[PDB]
Amino acid sequence: RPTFYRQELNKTIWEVPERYQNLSPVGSGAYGSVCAAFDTKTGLRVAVKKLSRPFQSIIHAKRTYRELRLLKHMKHENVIGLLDVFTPARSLEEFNDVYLVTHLMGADLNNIVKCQKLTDDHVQFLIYQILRGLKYIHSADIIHRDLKPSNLAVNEDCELKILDFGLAATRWYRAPEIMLNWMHYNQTVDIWSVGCIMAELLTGRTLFPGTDHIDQLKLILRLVGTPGAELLKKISSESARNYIQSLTQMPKMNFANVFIGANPLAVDLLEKMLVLDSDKRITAAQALAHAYFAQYHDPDDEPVADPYDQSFESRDLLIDEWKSLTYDEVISFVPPPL
Ligand SMILES: Nc1c(C(=O)c2cccc(OC3CCNCC3)c2)cnn1-c1ccc(F)cc1
């Protein structure tokens, strides 16, 4: 065991190994608070997230486990991975705190828009990397479910990583089928989000800034068109079906008339991502081979993930059971080679 040391940072205590120095709060992350730190062992800047009350309830305990499991599995250039996980606890009985260490990125996609002027070549590169990372997480039956600018982190290099996958305004980037639970969903819910993000990088404006679920759907159908007969057949919910057919019918628009002056190939890909029918929406693997990414696409360097075991998701266990499983995962963690 290494040597630990303590401090207060904005009304919360952090006990970390001595190898991490110059802790400096950066804000709120998923279920916790994150610090920038310096990693004396590797000379790298890192991000340390302290989970908040990790084992306070069954929900928290299961989610703490889930987050650690997911992060330990991700080994890909465009997905955030685990550099280190630690606790100040010497045994399972005093185990109450979890700290997760990853690379520190420079900004999120939200930040970098209003800072620098995004050319077409930048949008090509950023969306390419998102899709490359989505191919990887999807290949392991993991779905992000809440892809949005604030969980896309990027360096000054323009190198991008996806954060906060597998854990789930947020509503602005949600696929209509999971927001409304109106038809069966799959991995392509994330492709809907990618389309919304790509539209935003090209226009500088949110594509669908709805004030609630109904206004949101309204803004969407104004662009994509109300579902015809072939889509309505696939809607299992009676109430959802009745809302769609009771609305005043909207035509599908010409995306060229909406995304005026955008690269025509970019507009073509948007048209393929922003379809309501999830069985027809382009996948990440198909998207990577679209002509829009000709400059970046390499099929021998778009790898898939090892099998991921999420059978734990269907299980109902006690707090101390989830806690013990997490403890094992902390103990068994082997860091990456540097
Ligand atoms: N690695 C990061 C960041 C970042 O690196 C990040 C994200 C957005 C912006 C950002 O820039 C900072 C540095 C300079 N600008 C302001 C904050 C870093 C944020 N959260 N996490 C994280 C996720 C899971 C974990 F287990 C641990 C940490």
DSSP per-residue string spanning 288-322: HTSGGGTTT--GGG-PPPPP---GGGG----HHHH
Yes or no: say if 16 and 99 are a contact pair by the CB < 8 Å rule: yes
Q: Where in the chain is the domain with CATH 3.30.200.20?
A: 1-106+305-334
Q: Where in the chain is the domain with CATH 1.10.510.10?
A: 107-304
DSSP 212: S
Q: Which of 97, 146, 164, 190 is catalytic?
A: 164
* Ligand 1, atom nearest to 26 Cα: 17
**Topology of the domain covering 1-106+305-334:** Phosphorylase Kinase; domain 1 (3.30.200)
Determine the residue type at 178.
Answer: I
**Helix (H) / strand (E) containing 71:** helix 58-73
The three-point CA angle 121-112-23 to 5° equals: 135
* Ligand 1, atom nearest to 104 Cα: 5
Alpha carbons 108 and 96: distance in angstroms, whole number:
30
Active site residue 298: no
Closest alpha carbon to 80 in 34, 42, 121: 34
Going edge to edge, which strands form the sheet with 152-154?
A: 107-108, 152-154, 160-162
248: left (phi over 0), alpha (psi -120 to 50) or beta: beta
Experimental technique used? Answer: X-ray
- Whether domain 107-304 has CATH 1.10.510.10: the reply is yes
Q: Which residues pair with 13 in a beta bridge?
A: 8
Going edge to edge, which strands form the sheet with 84-86?
A: 20-29, 32-39, 44-51, 99-103, 84-86
Resolution in A: 2.1
* Ligand 1, atom nearest to 103 Cα: 1
**Helix (H) / strand (E) containing 168:** none
Q: Residues lining ligand 1, judged by CB closer than 6 Å?
A: 26, 29, 34, 47, 49, 71, 80, 100, 102, 104-108, 153, 163
DSSP 332: T
Annotated binding residues: 26-34, 49
Closest alpha carbon to 293 in 122, 110, 75: 122
